[PDB]
Amino acid sequence: PVQQTGGGNYIHVPLSPRTLNAWVKLVEDKKFGAEVVPGFQALSEGCTPYDINQMLNCVGDHQAAMQIIREIINDEAADWDAQHPIPGPLPAGQLRDPRGSDIAGTTSTVEEQIQWMYRPQNPVPVGNIYRRWIQIGLQKCVRMYNPTNILDVKQGPKEPFQSYVDRFYKSLRAEQTDPAVKNWMTQTLLIQNANPDCKLVLKGLGMNPTLEEMLTACQGV
Amino acid sequence: PVQQTGGGNYIHVPLSPRTLNAWVKLVEDKKFGAEVVPGFQALSEGCTPYDINQMLNCVGDHQAAMQIIREIINDEAADWDAQHPIPGPLPAGQLRDPRGSDIAGTTSTVEEQIQWMYRPQNPVPVGNIYRRWIQIGLQKCVRMYNPTNILDVKQGPKEPFQSYVDRFYKSLRAEQTDPAVKNWMTQTLLIQNANPDCKLVLKGLGMNPTLEEMLTACQGVG
Numbered sequence: 001p002v003q004q005t006g007g008g009n010y011i012h013v014p015l016s017p018r019t020l021n022a023w024v025k026l027v028e029d030k031k032f033g034a035e036v037v038p039g040f041q042a043l044s045e046g047c048t049p050y051d052i053n054q055m056l057n058c059v060g061d062h063q064a065a066m067q068i069i070r071e072i073i074n075d076e077a078a079d080w081d082a083q084h085p086i087p088g089p090l091p092a093g094q095l096r097d098p099r100g101s102d103i104a105g106t107t108s109t110v111e112e113q114i115q116w117m118y119r120p121q122n123p124v125p126v127g128n129i130y131r132r133w134i135q136i137g138l139q140k141c142v143r144m145y146n147p148t149n150i151l152d153v154k155q156g157p158k159e160p161f162q163s164y165v166d167r168f169y170k171s172l173r174a175e176q177t178d179p180a181v182k183n184w185m186t187q188t189l190l191i192q193n194a195n196p197d198c199k200l201v202l203k204g205l206g207m208n209p210t211l212e213e214m215l216t217a218c219q220g221v
Numbered sequence: 222p223v224q225q226t227g228g229g230n231y232i233h234v235p236l237s238p239r240t241l242n243a244w245v246k247l248v249e250d251k252k253f254g255a256e257v258v259p260g261f262q263a264l265s266e267g268c269t270p271y272d273i274n275q276m277l278n279c280v281g282d283h284q285a286a287m288q289i290i291r292e293i294i295n296d297e298a299a300d301w302d303a304q305h306p307i308p309g310p311l312p313a314g315q316l317r318d319p320r321g322s323d324i325a326g327t328t329s330t331v332e333e334q335i336q337w338m339y340r341p342q343n344p345v346p347v348g349n350i351y352r353r354w355i356q357i358g359l360q361k362c363v364r365m366y367n368p369t370n371i372l373d374v375k376q377g378p379k380e381p382f383q384s385y386v387d388r389f390y391k392s393l394r395a396e397q398t399d400p401a402v403k404n405w406m407t408q409t410l411l412i413q414n415a416n417p418d419c420k421l422v423l424k425g426l427g428m429n430p431t432l433e434e435m436l437t438a439c440q441g442v443g
Contacts, residue, residue: 192441203438204425 001047002114010118012110015051019043023055032065032145034173037138041131048113049105049130056134065145069137073104076133098124105130139176146174150185154193161198161218165190165211190214197221222268223335231339233331236272240264241279248280253362255395261359262352269334270326270351277355289365290358294325297354319345326351360397367395371406375414382419382439386411386432407432418443 003013026039044052056066077100087097098116101107103126116124150171155164168190172182191202191214198218202209205217224234247260265273281287298321311317316336323329323337324347337345371392376385389411393403408430412423419439423430426438 200422200425200442203422203442206427207434207437 001051002117010114012048012114015047015054020055020058024059027059028061032062032141034142037135040138044131047127048110049126050110050113052130053105065141068141069134072137073133077101077104095119097122098126103129142174146171150175150189155195157195161194162215222272223338231335233335236268236275241276244276245279253286253359253366255363258356258359265352269331269348270324271331271334273351273355274326286362289361290355293358294354298322298325319347323347324351363395364397367392371396371410376416378416379443381443383436385415386436416443
């Protein structure tokens with residue numbers, strides 16, 4: 001990561017072992033749940049790209065998804081170059097405006113990544129941008145790995161309604177739908193994909209019922 | 222109908238032929254159905270009583286229905302005469318005040334009917350009054366011919382609430398009854414004559430459910 005000493009000077013520091021270990025376990029034990037995206041952000045919060053790559057390169061299982069993440073990052077760097085003018089001839093001795101693989105950090109050293117993060121001329125915060133690219137790759141995997149889907153999620157006849165809800169929302173989250181679609185699905189598809197006995201009761205509650213009211217009333221049906 | 226010319230004068234522009242044909246087509250096909258009442262009102266907008274009598278004459282072949290309408294017009298005119306009696310002897314050099322049969326157009330010419338329709342001192346809308354008298358005659362025919370009383374109307378077991386509501390209201394319209402009886406029927410007889418599957422839900426909705434909430438809740442129920 002980054003350690004700033006007196007005088008405004010910046011230096012590189014190692015990334016703690018447990019943070020690397022905790023990231024590895026979250027990826028494997030949770031089988032890339034939808035919490036492997038935020039779990040990555042907190043553990044990587046305020047760190048440099050050189051140490052992130054390591055965390056992603058210290059995991060050996062679910063390696064196929066890691067290949068997907070690598071491809072997404074390359075594409076973000078491609079667009080970065082398209083939207084960032086190659087400065088061209090530059091005063092020699094001027095820190096090079098970091099390019100695409102200089103945000104990922106593959107073609108660059110940690111010190112200049114720290115120097116861009118706090119560059120007085122035009123600081124390029126390499127860390128937040130790269131974590132975001134990786135997050136998009138992680139999010140695609142959550143959707144690809146998701147076992148079922150919201151439409152096929154349906155309360156078992158003997159299954160309780162609340163269990164069906166835990167399955168429904170976890171998938172309304174794993175499948176990252178736009179908020180408006182989310183409101184429509186939550187207001188309607190939680191009643192339509194249910195069993196008929198409880199569905200009538202959910203209709204009896206009244207229009208625009210709320211989840212508290214829906215769970216309380218269908219409790220024990 | 223009536224047209225205006227330079228100077229503030231008025232003339233007659235007869236009801237057109239293809240407008241009369243449409244009135245005939247609505248009566249022959251719908252057979253004095255409920256829609257015959259509004260079709261007439263619209264095809265008669267801007268027209269005068271003489272032309273309303275032509276429209277009825279083209280469909281004069283129907284006689285049981287035209288006997289009911291004819292009876293009503295005579296009555297309303299008599300009431301007009303009773304509550305608007307002859308003011309007294311008529312000063313000469315002017316048009317008489319309208320009598321009940323003039324509103325009909327039987328004893329009166331169109332020009333006199335137009336002079337009242339556009340009389341500066343006190344214009345009498347001879348045209349609209351007669352259409353209303355005729356509409357009460359047409360409405361009675363609809364109720365006479367209505368094939369189904371609302372109490373019999375029910376929902377097919379696999380039939381939905383929407384079509385059943387459509388049929389239940391169709392009859393309630395033709396069965397003018399009174400607006401209050403309609404409220405009791407629309408909030409109860411609909412649920413009572415329904416099947417039990419959607420009634421359970423119509424009961425879950427709550428008390429005094431509105432139609433908007435009775436139709437939304439029972440969409441797909443059964």
